[model samples]
Target: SMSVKKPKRDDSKDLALCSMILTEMETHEDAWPFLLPVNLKLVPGYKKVIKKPMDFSTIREKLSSGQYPNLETFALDVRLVFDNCETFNEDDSDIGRAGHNMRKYFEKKWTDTFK
Candidate 1:
């Protein structure tokens, strides 16, 4: 009622791992910028900066519930995510710094656990 409304079949096994990693991403302190889509009202012109703005919540929904038919697709969003962060924030800023931190974390986890 809040002006809102609204793939990989039989892959709970894979989603389980994907979801677990996402949860870790969402739990990190720097995850603040990566949690939800940017607030267009608070953020000026983010829509222009990140044409395909993505975040963990939406990714979680897709990975756990199913829509990312390919795991690589899920991985793509993670890359897209940090890329958007850096594009919008300067390296000196918290968000931009966090973006690098989180990206490194993701790569490590992807190669270590998810590999």
Candidate 2:
């Protein structure tokens, strides 16, 4: 049996996370790519919506209407955004440091989720 149903988007947690990221990104320029549509050549056909500078508010709206195939793909796209930053510096760049901190935050969150 095949059925088509959409799950509810419970985005409160996502909004909170976005708030933290947005606060860190406030001091950085060219951070828009982190929120913009990614055209991943490796996937050959993957295209994303919600293309723009995403703040906590903007992301809330996008996620309310967005459809992600899975969290892994979404996470991959975010990592790609950070990976492509030419100015990402672990020692000096504020954005880079913020991103690193954000990654660590997620690591803890994911670990806590299963425990």
Candidate 3:
């Protein structure tokens, strides 16, 4: 599901990271890519709902809706897969997959902007 609003990020923190990356990117060309944000649309096929993936708030909402009782337990829910992802694959069937993908989309937006 695509969100009507975008996620809010800390611009100052992002700038600091960018500055540090820029300093290193100057000497190491490969580092330039690291400074760049990853794309979200490349992984998922949900062309209508989201340009990328959904966010934590959206995930929480779905879980709270009682549709997915399994996700209600956060302490024991899957962690590595969708709980924590630098980039997420477009596996919308699972909740974690969407969360991971959303994280990827947000990160990509953050990095790609102001470049």
User: How many clashes in each structure?
Assistant: 0, 0, 0
TM per candidate comes to 0.84, 0.39, 0.22
The clash number for model 1 is: 0
Candidate 2, 22-82: lDDT as tens digits:
4444334444434443445543423342233223334434444564344444444444444
Model 3 deviation from native, Cα RMSD in Å: 16.2
Put down candidate 1 lDDT per residue, 62-110, tens digits, no spaces: 7767699877899999999999998888999988899999999999999
Q: What stretches of model 1 exceed 4 Å from their correct place?
A: 1-12
Pick the TM-score winner: 1
TM-score, structure 3 vs. true = 0.22
Q: Where in model 2 is the C-alpha error above 4 Å?
A: 1-62, 85-90
Clashing pairs in 2: none
Model 2: how large is the Cα RMSD against the reference? 9.2
Q: RMSD for each model, in Å, please?
A: 9.7, 9.2, 16.2
lDDT of 3 by residue, 6-108 (tens): 7864455543443343243324422222222234466453344333343333334444464333322321222222332334334453543544544455346
